[PDB]
């Protein structure tokens, strides 16, 4: 039985280092398929074991495993492994189903959160019973309810719409999410995950959005642990994790400044279709980013939407008081254009 | 809960007589054991 | 005496200090002869040398010139005993010490 | 500026026929989303989410030059790389004692 | 633990070369706490 | 519809030589697999292989065009199918 | 060709910027030739050997035989100079 | 002032741009930044070479070995 | 251009560089104006 034997010697070309030789020779001694030495490897936490050894040129892998083993990274909360699975051709969008997510939100591994305290005082909110079953399965609609306390005022989560009740009574590519990063950094900030959340900030589409909402998020998670009388240390870790995603969202804002003023705008002011028909500066302000408005864009944005339809901008306050005191001095101003910049309520 | 026991490694330094002896307790074996030697220490880890 | 040119541009290029580099040439193989003629006048001149034309021009590095005439063109020899009797003359000079 | 834009029209002394306006229309509603959005259409939504995704690559990784250019990280790099230099000096200083020794040898041999 | 280690070697007292007790040393140390391994020994404070 | 009125093709039609193994012929395809002239007596049909191919795995999602031609075509009908077909530019 | 396809990957990490950088291969060794076969249909694939990943376009040029080079180098050879002999825009 | 005058601040003024630009550059040159990422790129090219070395003279040893067994 | 183009032994048309000067002059090169006035070209005789 010569191949199980693995030889170190010093200097040479045999490894170099005793782990290599001795992870290689557990690898080979499991004999298994690439599916059991990447848990192998994932229980290790070893991600450069599993890139040299198990991702190498001419691996074969069966179908599904991959999004096997992504599940269990995502689980146990390997933000490396899961940079890995994706650098290797695992996706997002054909990965994340509804019941992959509910199972993410329902597991038990990983770091502790607050997430069931939420769910319970939602809960007991919505139905006046109490305290939670054991054996409870918190469906993405409870999730949904526990976003709305949160990010607070109108604010109205797409997993309490009509449609998605309607998905999830008619079935426990429609249950694949359009956007799964968006959801996935809405899971990440609930179960108190910040490197997994900031790893998917950087994938993904409408990042602004994302840091301001996971912003408030945090802040919200932190004055509710404060006031439920829990470890002050979780309040803490929580307010530094909202400070973080502030300071991202205005690194963001200071890029686009440097890069293009009016799509830095027009940034700061579409329509956000997936976070309850917001705007960016209406979630900046309702998480009380003080140095977000407080950013020359902002600031100038606030006086775009100041002056109305007006160009003007120059020698302020005289022209609009002649205006008001003689109506025949308001024709002889510079207007807007038609489709300059329309700011409106309900289109 | 793949379907896999946790791994054992059977590292070897110097050793004697009785350690050849580990060495074929541990690969004839089910399941099989790796083993891993080192070099420079001498005596049965050098003759093997 | 190029590449003392060359060694005096990367002196220019990054020390403080004149070196006085005085250069002996014959004045009748220079190139563009009547572009220095004047009595204590600043004359320009050209540091481009064409590859035809067998005449060489000056090295544009240097402090000074003793440039001396036999009367021929385009021929050396004209430089090399007044060189000699110039820095024999010099080194019969008593040093300040 | 929210305020003042959701403010009505007409100042407060005639501020009761803009009152009776609103009434009126509640009244009609009844017979028969408080911001400032852009509502941007599909082109523009897709142009914005390209100069997103630009900014974001350009904020990473010029973070990553900063970090990679800072003489904190020069100082830290150098020092691993010259001790693992040290380290190979030692051994190739070992391998030319021991190759002199086998020129010494072949010179017997010869 | 995720990992099972088993050292054996010879009961009597050795030395090793220093940078291979050095290598040797920083690998079993560096393998047992990323992968969280159990090492199992001879106990008593003689040679490997 | 060009490429395929434009682009050949050559196909392994044989008298199976064995040589060395039984089942690899002069092509070195499986035997029963069948379906220049020297020892092949290859036969010239319209191609059934091009478009286009999408990379699954392997990190990035890309899309590469592809054709497949015989290997006695002019280069004249290959760079018109670059420079009119695929839309690139010289 | 791999060493060429780690670098166009690095340039997909590198820049959006796009290279068009034809791959000329017999067809012959390509594997799964079966999954290549199709008329302006896009084709999946899978990462006789593999096709690069990070590769434009393909020219795979088939002379009947399987698992054989030489396929593809007079081809080539004879596009090279069809397209040095044409003019330059200048 | 006359000709020969603006002749000789004309020389002036260049041993002042020639002064700045000079001194400029050694003060750039002697700052600690710069000769830590000088110092830090022949850190990198030398520990390159120096791998080199050590493989060239491995193989170079395994040589006088072959040689003198060989012999 | 200065390590091939400008090296020892080319030869060079009277009045092409200073159609290069214009030309690097109007495509905004100052670093091929560095190089075309340190080999020789000097700016009172270009300048009209």
Same mark, same amino acid.
């Given at each position: ?60 892998? %069966? ?114 999410? %359009? ?36 912003? =408030? ?101 005289? =022209? ?7 109506? %025949? ?6 207007? =807007? ?11 | ?9 059977? +590292? ?14 541990? +690969? ?19 003759? +093997? | ?9 990367? $002196? ?8 006085? @580099? ?24 050209? @540091? ?7 005449? @060489? ?6 402090? $000074? ?33 | ?66 970090? &990679? ?14 001790? &693992? ?7 190739? &200083? ?17 | ?48 | 519809?060009? /490429? ?11 008298? /199976? ?35 286009? /191919? ?37």
């Amino acid at each position: 039985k010569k191949e199980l034997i693995t030889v170190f010697r010093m200097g040479s070309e045999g490894h170099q280092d005793i782990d290599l030789a001795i992870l290689t020779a557990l690898l080979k001694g499991a004999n298994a398929s690439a599916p059991d030495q990447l848990s192998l490897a994932l229980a290790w936490n070893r991600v450069d074991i599993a890139r040299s050894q198990i991702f190498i040129y001419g691996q074969q892998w %069966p179908v599904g495993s991959l999004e096997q083993a992504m599940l269990d990274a995502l689980v146990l909360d390997r933000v490396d492994f899961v940079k890995l699975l994706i650098e290797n051709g695992v996706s997002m969008h054909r990965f994340l189903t509804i019941s992959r997510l509910e199972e993410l939100y329902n597991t038990r591994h990983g770091p502790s959160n607050t997430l069931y305290h939420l769910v319970r005082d939602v809960k007991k909110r919505e139905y006046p019973k109490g305290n939670l079953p054991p054996d409870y399965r918190i469906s993405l609609i409870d999730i949904g309810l526990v976003i709305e306390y949160l990010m607070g005022g109108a604010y109205r989560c797409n997993y309490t719409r009509k449609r998605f009740r309607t998905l999830y009574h008619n079935l426990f590519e429609i249950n694949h999410f %359009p956007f799964p990063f968006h959801e996935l950094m809405v899971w990440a900030v609930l179960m108190k995950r910040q490197k997994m959340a900031l790893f998917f900030w950087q994938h993904g589409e409408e990042a602004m959005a994302k840091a301001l909402v996971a912003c =408030k998020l945090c802040k919200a998670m932190a004055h509710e642990a404060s006031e439920n009388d829990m470890v002050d240390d979780i309040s803490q870790e929580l307010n530094h994790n909202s400070r973080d995603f502030g300071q991202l969202a205005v690194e963001l804002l200071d890029q686009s400044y440097k890069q293009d003023e009016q799509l830095a705008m027009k940034l700061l002011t579409y329509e956000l279709k997936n976070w309850s028909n917001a705007t960016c500066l209406q979630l900046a302000v309702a998480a009380k980013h003080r140095d977000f408005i407080a950013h020359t864009c902002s600031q100038m944005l606030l006086t775009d939407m100041w002056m109305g339809r007006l160009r003007m901008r120059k020698n302020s306050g005289l =022209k609009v008081i002649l205006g008001i005191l003689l109506p %025949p001095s308001i024709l002889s101003l510079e207007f =807007k254009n038609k489709d300059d910049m329309p700011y409106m309520t309900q289109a | 809960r793949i379907g896999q026991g946790v791994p054992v490694v059977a +590292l070897i330094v110097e050793g004697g007589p009785n350690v050849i002896s580990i060495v074929l307790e541990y +690969l004839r074996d089910t399941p099989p054991v790796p083993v891993v030697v080192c070099d420079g220490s001498g005596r049965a880890s050098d003759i +093997l | 005496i190029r590449h003392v040119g060359d060694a005096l541009k990367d $002196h220019a290029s990054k020390s403080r200090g004149k070196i006085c @580099t005085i250069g002996i040439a014959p004045w009748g193989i220079v190139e563009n002869q009547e572009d220095l003629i004047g009595r204590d006048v600043v004359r320009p001149y050209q @540091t481009m040398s064409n590859p035809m034309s067998k005449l @060489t021009v000056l090295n544009s590095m240097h402090s $000074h010139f003793i440039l001396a005439d036999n009367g021929t063109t385009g021929k050396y020899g004209a430089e090399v005993k007044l060189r000699r009797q110039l820095e024999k003359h010099i080194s019969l000079q008593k040093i300040n010490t | 500026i929210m305020t003042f834009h959701e403010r009505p029209v007409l100042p407060p002394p005639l501020i009761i026929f803009s009152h009776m306006t609103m009434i009126f229309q509640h009244l009609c509603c009844r017979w028969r989303d408080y911001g400032l959005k852009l509502f941007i259409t599909d082109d523009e939504l897709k142009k914005v989410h390209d100069f997103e995704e630009q900014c974001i690559e350009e904020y990473f990784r010029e973070k990553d030059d900063r970090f &990679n250019s800072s003489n904190d990280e020069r100082i830290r790099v150098t020092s691993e790389r010259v001790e &693992n230099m040290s380290m190979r000096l030692e051994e190739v &200083n070992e391998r030319e004692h021991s190759m002199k020794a086998s020129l010494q040898t072949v010179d017997i041999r010869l | 633990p995720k990992l099972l280690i088993s050292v054996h070697g010879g009961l009597q007292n050795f030395e090793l070369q220093p940078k291979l007790k050095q290598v040797f040393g920083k690998g079993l140390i560096k393998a047992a706490m990323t992968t969280g391994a159990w090492i199992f020994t001879g106990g008593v404070n003689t040679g490997v | 519809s060009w /490429i395929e009125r434009a682009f050949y093709k050559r196909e392994c039609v044989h008298i /199976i030589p064995s040589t060395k193994d039984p089942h690899r012929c002069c092509c070195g395809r499986l035997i029963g697999q069948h379906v220049w002239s020297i020892s092949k007596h290859t036969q010239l049909s319209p191609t059934d292989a091009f478009g286009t /191919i999408e990379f699954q795995g392997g990190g990035h999602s890309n899309k590469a065009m592809y054709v497949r031609v015989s290997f006695d075509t002019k280069p004249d009908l290959l760079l018109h199918l670059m420079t009119k077909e695929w839309q690139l530019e010289l």
